[PDB]
Amino acid sequence: MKHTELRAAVLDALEKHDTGATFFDGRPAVFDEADFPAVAVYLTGAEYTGEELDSDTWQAELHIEVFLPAQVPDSELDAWMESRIYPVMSDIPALSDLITSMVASGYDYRRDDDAGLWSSADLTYVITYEM
Amino acid sequence: MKHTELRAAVLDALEKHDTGATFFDGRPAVFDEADFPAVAVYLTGAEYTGEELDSDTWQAELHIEVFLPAQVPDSELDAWMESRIYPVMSDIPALSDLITSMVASGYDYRRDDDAGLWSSADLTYVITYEM
Amino acid sequence: MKHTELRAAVLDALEKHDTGATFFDGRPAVFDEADFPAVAVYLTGAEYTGEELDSDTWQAELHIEVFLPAQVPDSELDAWMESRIYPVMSDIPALSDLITSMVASGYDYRRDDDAGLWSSADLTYVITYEM
Amino acid sequence: MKHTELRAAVLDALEKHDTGATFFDGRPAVFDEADFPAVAVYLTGAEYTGEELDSDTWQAELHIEVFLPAQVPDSELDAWMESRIYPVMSDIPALSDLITSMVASGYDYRRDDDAGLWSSADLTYVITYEM
Amino acid sequence: MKHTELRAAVLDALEKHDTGATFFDGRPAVFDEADFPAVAVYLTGAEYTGEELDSDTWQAELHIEVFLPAQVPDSELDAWMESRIYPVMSDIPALSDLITSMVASGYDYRRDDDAGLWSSADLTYVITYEM
Amino acid sequence: MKHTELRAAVLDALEKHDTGATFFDGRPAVFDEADFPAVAVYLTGAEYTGEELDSDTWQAELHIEVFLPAQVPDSELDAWMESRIYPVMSDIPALSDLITSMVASGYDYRRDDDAGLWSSADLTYVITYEM
Amino acid sequence: DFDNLFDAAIARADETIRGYMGTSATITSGEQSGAVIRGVFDDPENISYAGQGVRVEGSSPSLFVRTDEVRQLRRGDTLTIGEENFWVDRVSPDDGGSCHLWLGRGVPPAVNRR
Amino acid sequence: DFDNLFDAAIARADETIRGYMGTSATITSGEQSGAVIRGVFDDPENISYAGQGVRVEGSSPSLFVRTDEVRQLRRGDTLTIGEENFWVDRVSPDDGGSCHLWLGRGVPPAVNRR
Amino acid sequence: DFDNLFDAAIARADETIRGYMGTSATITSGEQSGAVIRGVFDDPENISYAGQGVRVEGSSPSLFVRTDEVRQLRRGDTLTIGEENFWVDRVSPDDGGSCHLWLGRGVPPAVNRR
Amino acid sequence: DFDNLFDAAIARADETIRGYMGTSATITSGEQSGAVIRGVFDDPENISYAGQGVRVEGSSPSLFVRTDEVRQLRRGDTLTIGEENFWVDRVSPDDGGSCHLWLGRGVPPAVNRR
Amino acid sequence: DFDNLFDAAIARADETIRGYMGTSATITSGEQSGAVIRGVFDDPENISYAGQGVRVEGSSPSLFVRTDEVRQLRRGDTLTIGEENFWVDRVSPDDGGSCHLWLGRGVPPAVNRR
Amino acid sequence: DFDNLFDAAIARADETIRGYMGTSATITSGEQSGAVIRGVFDDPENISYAGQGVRVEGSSPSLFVRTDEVRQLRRGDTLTIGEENFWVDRVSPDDGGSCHLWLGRGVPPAVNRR
């Protein structure tokens, strides 16, 4: 619905700064050891919390995952989502017009254990949007 | 018995719009690489929430499955579900005749990881019906 | 004890209508590919909800399984549980004499995943009985 | 310990009624295909519910569970536990003196899926007792 | 922690009774088929429930494991645990000084199915201790 | 976030006390049997407990892992966290500057089951901070 | 008879093996009733633990008899390996020249059909 | 015929094994309708348990067709092995000279396509 | 003696291995009481962990007796390998000429029958 | 050229098996565009079930091309063998003288790069 | 000495293999204290992950000494393979002529007996 | 040189395989700095999936280096296979004559030790 344009707007607002990372839209990914540390944006959930007898007022969940190689220390990830992600999206008017209300949900770490080919930091947001 | 006419009505409503997809009704599916991106429709749950001493007034969940090949970007899946599925149940007289109340519950994504043949999107609808 | 009498009465009520399927009573089942689509009746649970200081007033769950060839479409299964078993057992005097209270619980499906030998459908009732 | 005399007394109550089965006390059991259908009695739980400030008043669970040949139908199990166990366990003075309050909890079935040598039906009471 | 001195005190107090067992302290255990039926004492939990604005007032849980060979009947397990552990610690002044409040929590059995060299009985106590 | 700064501050405070172990910041670790028994410090959680419309007021959890030889008795672990971690951080002004509220959460053990190559003890701490 | 020029070989081999090992047996009850079949009996182990442990060590007899004789057995019928008594539980589908007969022990448990 | 020098050998091998092994078969319905395919048929034994004990022991037949004759077959059509009636469920892709045919039993289940 | 032509050979073979391998064993207790059984004893090594570290490493002795001389052995009675005593726990059914004997160690644990 | 005295043997081996089995392939799209590569194509089965019954039976094509030609193919381009069209999904790393080439089917799905 | 006629052969074989592949080893502490034995040493690799990621690479040494010398070794005492210092953790039971010796590394961790 | 009679043979074989099957690795950085080894390198292919589909296909190189020339190699230092730049991750323990060098790719990630 608006997921395509919401993702486009958020990736554009992410790309305004200096480059140095791939900006994989959506989800299929397929990285290989040449397009490394990168960022992927996608959505989940999207249920029918009504909350008002005026419109559907749906709500979904935003995932932005940044991938760095293998056993790179978590200081690099900390720097990444303190400099490249968290402040840059804090005020984007395009998303403000596209969605109703924005609120942070969580931010965690995961990694490959067997063969350790990757290490991801996930930032998870909650979107209330009128679709 | 209302399941068969409900499935037939929703399937006919889906087919009335632009074609271009297989419309596998029921359950067993069986796709092969010829009948690709397709839509299936089925029911689950159907317990006995009485709520009134006038009729059984059961309620169940309707799944609209849509299947796309392998790693087609989820933007195209969003486009498919918006241009093909979601708006059509905005107002269908046959369903309003058949069932009592119909509300949305969810809309999710999933896919095959091993051998990655398929990628599916699910529309979950809550239906209160009396039979 | 009431389990044997309950099963006998319900199987007799089922066989009262026109036949066309096996009426396996009990538990062991064992089908082979000649005794197909069949119906089995059994009991589960049997807790000791007191609810009144005059008798034990136990309650349990009655399961009616129906088994169909492999991956037949669910339309015939819907027909089987909304035109073959639900209406006939909706009012059976013998159970009313035997059982204090009869309430519907659920109606679900399940298909054999590996090797797909069967497609089974479950119809589950709840029983408040005193013995 | 009261567990030993509880097991001895319930075993005596079971054996006083017409015999015809083994009465393996405890837990290790071990059967072979000569000591078949047989009943075992044991205890589980045994926490420290207070229930009063003068005595510890512990409570545990009593399992009386019987084993019958492989895929024997449930009819003989229903004949067993509601004619040989439940009527017997209705009132025995020794247990009444030994324990404080006696309440039945549940009565369920199970069988060996793989191999399939046995079919065991369990029957559990809850004991409130003071050590 | 003070766990070392607590374990030493309880181990010495329970050692003062009749011998005839090994008194493994702490975690590693390692039995072999020569130091058999034995008792181990250890601790788990130890979070920061405050419940008083004067000190940390931590609380943890104490396990008393007792190991017997293979398929010994649980009757002698009860005899062991009602002769070597449960009565002996009911009043030990050293532990009373060392900890604040002593409350029993549970007492259960476990046994080895595969291979089956051991059978353990667990005594779980709860401790509120200030440190 | 300030996770790098907080980790550096707590690690420097720990190193100020008498050394004797490796001081792994972050989480990649990689020990081998030469940098053995050691301590690692890392962060998890980082949700958005708002609690007031004046700051983000995020909160997270601090893991202090300590690794000891294989099946070393837990007495050494108790001594370690009664002498090396729990007392030393009880009052550090740098953390008080960096964060707002800091409360103990838990303290647990776990050893390697298969191949038994290590034994870890975890100090879990709760922290609130603004970004 | 067999339009394969290979199933004849496998049938001859099956006859040879059945005659070279596995003794004989006779049937009680069933449409065959009194009859004698030559097979190859075997009995492996099988252990189950049920509860915390209730080890019920048993056996799973098998016969591997040729398919022609064991037609119209159904399941409730019994059989004797000489002195000892078993009962047919499952009949394997024909592999081309024979089938595996799975047997229980003692009296077959009820019928519980209707 | 093929830029192979090897698939020719495997094709001759497939022809010779299907000649030396397996039976003929008469396809029924479908676009082929009356036609005879020579294959090698096997019936492995497979059992499911479902609920508590609900053993549904059955077989999973296969015939191992040659690739050429089975084109435009789809799945709804049926077939006859000698005197017994099967129906094809799945057709494998060619491995170079042949493809396994997965068989059902009895009447094919509906169509359920619209 | 047996309608076998093959079980006689395997009986000869197992007796040959028992005479060529394994030791003798003096059985005590049970109905057999004092007797000497020849068989091949082995002690596979098995470890259980119970909790986190509760390693209870031990062995699972076996002896591979011949069924005929060891019938009605039951379970409770013990036996002596060389100079140190085990106790039987399970008796496998005969595979055609003999069976495996599983043994414990030390005094058998109670009876717990009634 | 090959500083191993062994990689020459494996290179001759790969050349022999590629010229002895498999077919030629005309690559379309990509920087190579019109070019013919000799490889060994195979299409193993793969079955996925998704839900209860959603069987989506397919295939997993592979080619096993030598490493020199497969250089700078990326992933987006397509390919055709004989008359049928595929598209490369993944390129295996060199094993010394070649690398398996993993093929999809039909049009490659978008790019979704930025 | 061995009443088997086979354990003599296995003992000769064990002596031969220990002499042809083994290495010397000097046990220290324990009741043996200063003593020298011979055994085939090996050091397999093993990895573990203690959380989101903690790579603890280690080795699992083994020695395979004959059972006669390994008697009354207990577990606390230690041993030197040339210069390297290990400590026995577990002693495998007799397999007929020898037993594997499971080795640790560094100082044995406490005793923690009582 | 060794109380072996066997490890000498395995060392000769190790040298033979290194000469006949291997590459001239050149090392930069670390205490060894500029040095040359003859190690047989292989690149097995491994893929992870992470989320929905996040395939991160890559390789896990290995070198099979001889222990004597690669002592005190540590982990942080890098390596060069001809024109390609790798970095060692972990060093396997000696199996008797050599060890497997597990290799990474690109710049080693930080040190993160203080």
UniProtKB/Swiss-Prot annotation, chains A, B, C, D, E, F:
Q: Provide the alphabetized UniProt keywords.
A: Host cytoplasm, Late protein, Viral genome ejection through host cell envelope, Viral long flexible tail ejection system, Viral penetration into host cytoplasm, Viral release from host cell, Viral tail assembly, Viral tail protein, Virion, Virus entry into host cell
Annotated GO CC locations? host cell cytoplasm; virus tail
List cystine links. none
User: Which is an annotated Pfam family here?
Assistant: Phage_tail_U
Residue ranges crossing the lipid bilayer per the database entry:
none
**InterPro entries registered for this protein in UniProt:** GpU-like_sf (IPR038512), Phage_lambda_GpU-like (IPR009312), Phage_tail_protein-like_sf (IPR035934)
Q: Which GO terms describe its biological process?
A: symbiont genome ejection through host cell envelope, long flexible tail mechanism; viral tail assembly
The places in or outside the cell where this protein is found are: Virion; Host cytoplasm
Q: What is its main location?
A: virion
Superkingdom of the organism of origin = Viruses
Q: How does it assemble?
A: Homohexamer. May bind to major tail protein V, and /or tape measure protein.
Say what the protein does: Plays an essential role in tail assembly by capping the rapidly polymerizing tail once it has reached its requisite length and serving as the interaction surface for the completion protein.
Question: Can you tell me which family this protein belongs to?
Answer: Belongs to the lambda-like tail terminator protein family.
Protein's name in the database:
Tail tube terminator protein
| Species in which this protein is naturally found | Escherichia phage lambda (Bacteriophage lambda)
From Swiss-Prot, chains G, H, I, J, K, L:
| Protein keywords | Host cytoplasm, Late protein, Viral capsid assembly, Viral release from host cell, Virion
Cellular component, GO, one term: virion component
Q: What is an annotated GO biological process for this record, any one?
A: virion assembly
Report the subcellular localization: Virion; Host cytoplasm
Q: What does this protein do?
A: Plays a role in virion assembly by joining the head and the tail at the last step of morphogenesis. Six FII proteins probably bind protein W that closes the DNA-filled capsid, as well as the U tail terminator protein of the pre-assembled tail.
Q: How does it assemble?
A: May bind head-to-tail joining protein W and protein U.
Q: What is this protein called?
A: Head-tail connector protein FII
Species of the source: Escherichia phage lambda (Bacteriophage lambda)
Q: What is the lineage of its organism?
A: Viruses, Duplodnaviria, Heunggongvirae, Uroviricota, Caudoviricetes
